[PDB]
Design a protein around this ligand. Structure first.
Ligand SMILES: O=[S@]1OC[C@@H]2[C@H](CO1)[C@]1(Cl)C(Cl)=C(Cl)[C@@]2(Cl)C1(Cl)Cl
Length: 272
């Protein structure tokens, strides 16, 4: 029940997602692994310990490596998973950049609104992709042969980002709804340094209209009443999570440098 332009819009986004999302993480390799001012630390202490994960690697031969992280003993132990996380983030960010670049609506913006929309939304698009491999019953992100298992209840969902992943997973969205959420978020007319506000705003309104129409054509069940409005509220939450994670990343980077070159680009760090 979508117009021809709407069906075209979904097809192009589904196509860009198919070409740039390595859902089995086959091409993520060469990554680092964990080895074998007072109020600043307390804040970074608080920052890192809210999402503790164990790590699993399944070998191509049938072997398994498992990593249980240290307990908080007040020292540098809390940074042991950071270089690995930054390699995963970088790998995810590359996929996200390729996603934007293959979308015609994105390619037709000026190069400096592109860079500035990407800086605004890279974390949000990455979290949206990670929700699709998140297993809410085991508390696990299943990334191919890599697994990231949350670490022992519902106090765990006090961390807003964990609560976001569980709430988003409960809506049981289709692939099309996920990519439309990525578009609406990528084309946010109000990111720092956007110049073509009006063009980006019309594109966004239009990805939103397609999503509302998609839901109305394909989900008549009483369970998905107001589903479109739940998605828009989740996007608002994610924008907020996104700003909190940016501050926390800069606080950590301030006392313990870890960001990759691509992360420095996306987050304003100049290397000087
Ligand atoms: O790409 S980055 O590195 C991956 C980590 C974070 C996202 O940023 C979180 Cl929040 C998510 Cl999502 C996953 Cl998956 C993990 Cl493992 C946790 Cl720590 Cl749960």
């Amino acid at each position: 029940g979508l117009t021809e332009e709407q069906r075209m819009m979904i097809r192009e986004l589904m196509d860009a997602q198919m070409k740039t999302f390595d859902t089995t993480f086959s091409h993520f390799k060469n990554f680092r692994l964990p080895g074998v001012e007072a109020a600043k630390w307390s804040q970074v202490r608080k920052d890192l310990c809210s999402l503790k994960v164990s790590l699993q690697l399944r070998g191509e031969d049938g072997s398994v490596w498992n990593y249980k992280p240290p307990a908080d003993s007040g020292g540098k132990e809390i940074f042991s998973l950071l270089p690995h996380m930054a390699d995963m983030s970088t790998y995810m960010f590359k996929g996200i950049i390729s996603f934007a670049k293959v979308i015609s609506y994105f390619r037709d913006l000026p190069i400096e609104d592109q860079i500035s929309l990407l800086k605004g939304a890279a974390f949000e698009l990455c979290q949206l992709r990670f929700n699709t491999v998140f297993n809410a019953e085991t508390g696990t992100w299943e990334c191919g042969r890599l697994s990231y298992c949350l670490e022992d209840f519902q106090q765990l969902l006090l961390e807003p980002m964990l609560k976001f992943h569980y709430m988003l997973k409960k809506l049981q969205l289709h692939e099309e709804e996920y990519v439309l959420m990525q578009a609406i978020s990528l084309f946010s007319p109000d990111r720092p340094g956007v110049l073509q506000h009006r063009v980006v705003d019309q594109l966004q309104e239009q990805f939103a209209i397609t999503l509302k129409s998609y839901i109305e054509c394909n989900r008549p069940q009483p369970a998905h009443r107001f589903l479109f409005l739940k998605i828009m509220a989740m996007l608002t939450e994610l924008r907020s999570i996104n700003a909190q994670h940016t501050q926390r990343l800069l606080r950590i980077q301030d006392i313990h440098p870890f960001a990759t070159p691509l992360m420095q680009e996306l987050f304003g760090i100049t290397g000087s």
